Design a protein around this ligand. Sequence first.
Ligand SMILES: Nc1ncnc2c1ncn2[C@@H]1O[C@H](C(=O)N2CCN(CC(=O)Nc3cccc4c3CNC4=O)CC2)[C@@H](O)[C@H]1O
Length: 248
Amino acid sequence: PESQLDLRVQELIKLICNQSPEHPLDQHYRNLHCALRPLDHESYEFKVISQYLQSTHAPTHSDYTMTLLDLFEVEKDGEKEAFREDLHNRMLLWHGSRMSNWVGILSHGLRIAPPEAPITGYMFGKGIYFADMSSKSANYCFASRLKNTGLLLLSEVALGQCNELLEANPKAEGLLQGKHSTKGLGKMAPSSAHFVTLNGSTVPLGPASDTGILNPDGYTLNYNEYIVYNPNQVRMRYLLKVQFNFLQ
Ligand SMILES: Nc1ncnc2c1ncn2[C@@H]1O[C@H](C(=O)N2CCN(CC(=O)Nc3cccc4c3CNC4=O)CC2)[C@@H](O)[C@H]1O
């Protein structure tokens, strides 16, 4: 009958999901094995992440804006222990996805791309993909004017040593040669000057600027992507409930 979850967590669950004594909402929430605790809109963490979202909304993604409706702290049991805390270049990075995938993601954590690949391969191999531009990830939410509420995931990502690459390459994991991740280089990115620290992870705050990068061969990426090939380089921390405002 009556739910034991904060109302904000209730509405989150209604969104990504769907007589016991347990409310069916509380059932779904319990079966995620994932803490989701709402944060106060005046707290520092809300302010910083709110800024992260807005300042790293890409200039060439002007076909919409985003509003932060609700902010959540994510704590997946076991992830802190498994995490590669040893590695340097630990960044708080964006991950966007279809609505149908959030139960899976909150239930098992982020997985590397499925082993039965498409026949071309993945753009940068079988890993877990992140962005430092909020709107680059949000375009992976496949939101619409009707379905204009989506989620963005913020995660601590142990990048360690990056293998920097100018173009797409399915064999990227192989090209690592001992380094701990791939970084696909974009024409534009946040620069270290405006960077900030939140609980031991660098947060690459905007604005983005030209990186002077050009691919001498073909097409060069608009914005960076970061790829790690072991889930223990990932630790979920925040879940943003975000509103997409499409123009005209
Ligand atoms: N446990 C899980 N349950 C359900 N879905 C899960 C899951 N773990 C990952 N996923 C989802 O699988 C999907 C996946 O592997 N894919 C599809 C996407 N593809 C390329 C890719 O990741 N591009 C890409 C590039 C840059 C940034 C971002 C992405 C995706 N999200 C971003 O913010 C790589 C293979 C992905 O959309 C992820 O959200």
